[PDB]
Ligand binder design. Structure first.
Ligand SMILES: OC[C@H]1O[C@@H](O[C@H]2[C@H](O)[C@@H](O)[C@H](O)O[C@@H]2CO)[C@H](O)[C@@H](O)[C@@H]1O
Ligand SMILES: [Ca+2]
Ligand SMILES: [Ca+2]
Ligand SMILES: [Ca+2]
Length: 189
């Protein structure tokens, strides 16, 4: 429900900056489809500065696949932001869904834009690391500012079928259209 992100500016390249160690790690344990022991999950660290929100997601996934024509059905990570944290039941102008797969290919849901999304992906033993920067659209964050946030891992099998949907705050697979399913992220100094 609630987490924090330390102020900081990491380099987007898929490598783990020392600074990521200064912020808490959250886990995607809100299951909508699949299970924690059998499907893709991520260990996530979050940082922020006046211009972007930064996300480091270490994904556990032994089988990588992107054969499905649906981007949400390819092994990928989705990031959700609610800048004014209104927790509405639908997307406002400030709300957004961003997506990037293990090949660092970006796709977008409502509100998401490539002009505000920089990403890098590096494969690792047993999975992959996603490092992203999301440019704020409507706000200029200050310490103790609270935004709505969620991160989801889509797990596809060798058959190109999505078998897992696990996020941090949403076990109902509605984050793509319902910000009220996002958790709260306090931007701290
Ligand atoms: O992302 C835009 C796209 O979303 C599709 O819904 C996905 C959603 O993106 C994802 O977060 C969730 O896990 O799965 C649903 C599908 O069940 C939606 O169907 C598209 O119309 C829309 O363009
Ligand atoms: Ca880095
Ligand atoms: Ca909003
Ligand atoms: Ca997979």
């Amino acid at each position: 429900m609630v987490a924090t992100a330390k102020y900081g500016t990491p380099v987007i390249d898929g490598e783990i900056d020392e600074i990521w160690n200064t912020t808490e790690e959250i886990e995607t344990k809100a299951v909508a489809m699949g299970s924690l022991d059998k499907n893709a999950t991520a260990k996530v660290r979050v940082l922020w500065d006046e211009n972007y929100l930064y996300v480091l997601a270490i994904v556990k996934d032994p089988v990588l696949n992107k054969d499905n024509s649906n981007p949400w059905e390819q092994d990928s990570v989705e990031i959700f932001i609610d800048e004014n944290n209104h927790k509405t039941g639908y997307y406002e102008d400030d709300d957004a869904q961003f997506r990037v797969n293990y090949m660092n290919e970006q796709t977008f849901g409502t509100g998401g834009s490539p002009a505000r999304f920089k990403t890098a992906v590096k494969l690792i033993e047993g999975g992959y690391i996603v490092e992203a920067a999301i440019k704020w659209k409507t706000i200029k964050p200050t310490p103790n500012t609270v935004i709505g946030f969620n991160i989801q891992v889509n797990d596809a099998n060798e058959k190109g079928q999505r078998v897992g949907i696990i996020s941090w705050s949403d076990p109902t697979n509605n984050s793509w259209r319902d910000p009220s399913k996002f958790g709260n992220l306090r931007l701290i100094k």
